Design a protein around this ligand. Structure first.
Ligand SMILES: Nc1ccn([C@H]2C[C@H](O)[C@@H](COP(=O)(O)NP(=O)(O)OP(=O)(O)O)O2)c(=O)n1
Ligand SMILES: [Mg+2]
Ligand code: NA
Ligand code: NA
Length: 327
DNA sequence: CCGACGTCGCATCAGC
DNA sequence: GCTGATGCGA
DNA sequence: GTCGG
């Protein structure tokens, strides 16, 4: 639809959602509000009453009550108050720093640290991830135009193949779904000599190289299968320098790679459909495998998969191309 | 009335 | 020292 | 906060 149909309402519900997660630490109230925000967002009519909204799945009595107050007064008293509150609105803000969750934000504000200025005055009190997230607070909230994504994919695939030509690397996320912009780069890595029944340097070796050509600039976390870090394109000539970008790289066993590809390609909305269409025909899908339920509910063994399509040939669905996968 | 409501890899904490 | 729990992000 | 066993 259009936001301006029920935008004020969905904004309200999203704002309320963030305070539940970050300040109240009620994650199920956080999800409740987003679920409601979602079903209202795709609701193709202007909501004239709370009761009308209550008809939608995910909207119950309390939110209906809230919509009436917003409709009648243009605002929500509880929201206005908590927005004005110095403790709560500070805690909520600090969580925008990657590495700082609801718990870390709490401790910081408890002992006086409320702002980015405060965080900078207190580097010693931050862990490694949190300094990077701080250092790139601005950049991390910027989005990535597809042109830069392609430029990034260019570098990644080139270096990956350069280290070992038998690597297979796929950029997933919304990029693979042909999206016009992207929040980050999510790379999926595999190699013939890494299977479910299977070197720890397979992941390491790729990271090392991307560092050697100065693509990767910082490391948030790094293990034997999951890398999370920061990358940056080279600056062209005179022109200003690019924003630092978030990039993940995951190593997956060759046989689990396509359940991996599908799952991390998204979308969320779609992945639940494909999850829950699938249940119908007696199959469950994780990020690793597809399991056949099962005379019980007993997931039996996972069934072999060496293509994305192979999967659609276990639950009898029409292979869907990546750009028609937002539902 | 009251429990379910996402899962998993890594960094760091709590505790022995 | 190590194991297990908790915080965090995606 | 919402939904349902
Ligand atoms: N909270 C979250 C968010 C994402 N994910 C998983 C499922 C998603 O398909 C995948 C990508 O997450 P994502 O980066 O937030 N979304 P996506 O890359 O598709 O869109 P943009 O970040 O490009 O805007 O990671 C998750 O498991 N838990
Ligand atoms: Mg992404
Ligand atoms: Na409803
Ligand atoms: Na955060």
């Amino acid at each position: 639809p259009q936001e301006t149909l029920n935008g004020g309402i969905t904004d309200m519900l999203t704002e309320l959602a963030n305070f539940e997660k970050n300040v109240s630490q009620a994650i199920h109230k956080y999800n409740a509000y987003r679920k409601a925000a979602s079903v209202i967002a795709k609701y193709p009519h202007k909501i004239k009453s709370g009761a009308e909204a209550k008809k939608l799945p995910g909207v119950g009595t309390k939110i209906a009550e809230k919509i009436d107050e917003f409709l009648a007064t243009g605002k929500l008293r509880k929201l206005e108050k908590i927005r004005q509150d110095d403790t709560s609105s500070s805690i909520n803000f600090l969580t925008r720093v990657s590495g700082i969750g609801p718990s870390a934000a709490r401790k910081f504000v408890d002992e006086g640290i409320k702002t980015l200025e405060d965080l900078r005055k207190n580097e010693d009190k931050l862990n490694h991830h949190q300094r990077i997230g701080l250092k790139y607070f601005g950049d991390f909230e910027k989005r990535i135009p597809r042109e830069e994504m392609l430029q990034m994919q260019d570098i990644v695939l080139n270096e990956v193949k350069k280290v070992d030509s038998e690597y297979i690397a796929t950029v997933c996320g919304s990029f693979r779904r042909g999206a016009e912009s992207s929040g980050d780069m999510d790379v999926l890595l595999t190699h013939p000599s890494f299977t479910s029944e299977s070197q720890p340097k397979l992941l390491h070796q790729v990271v090392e190289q991307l560092q050697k050509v100065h693509f990767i600039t910082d490391t948030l976390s790094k293990g034997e299968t999951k890398f999370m870090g920061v990358c940056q394109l080279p600056s062209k000539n005179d022109e200003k320098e690019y924003p630092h970008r978030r990039i993940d790289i995951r190593l997956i066993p060759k046989d689990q790679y396509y359940c991996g590809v599908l799952y991390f390609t998204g979308s969320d909305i779609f992945n639940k459909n494909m999850r829950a269409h699938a249940l119908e025909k007696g199959f469950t899908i994780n990020e690793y495998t597809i399991r056949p339920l099962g005379v019980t509910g007993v997931a039996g063994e996972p069934l072999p998969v060496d293509s994305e399509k192979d999967i659609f040939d276990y639950i009898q669905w029409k292979y869907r191309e990546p750009k028609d996968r937002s539902e």
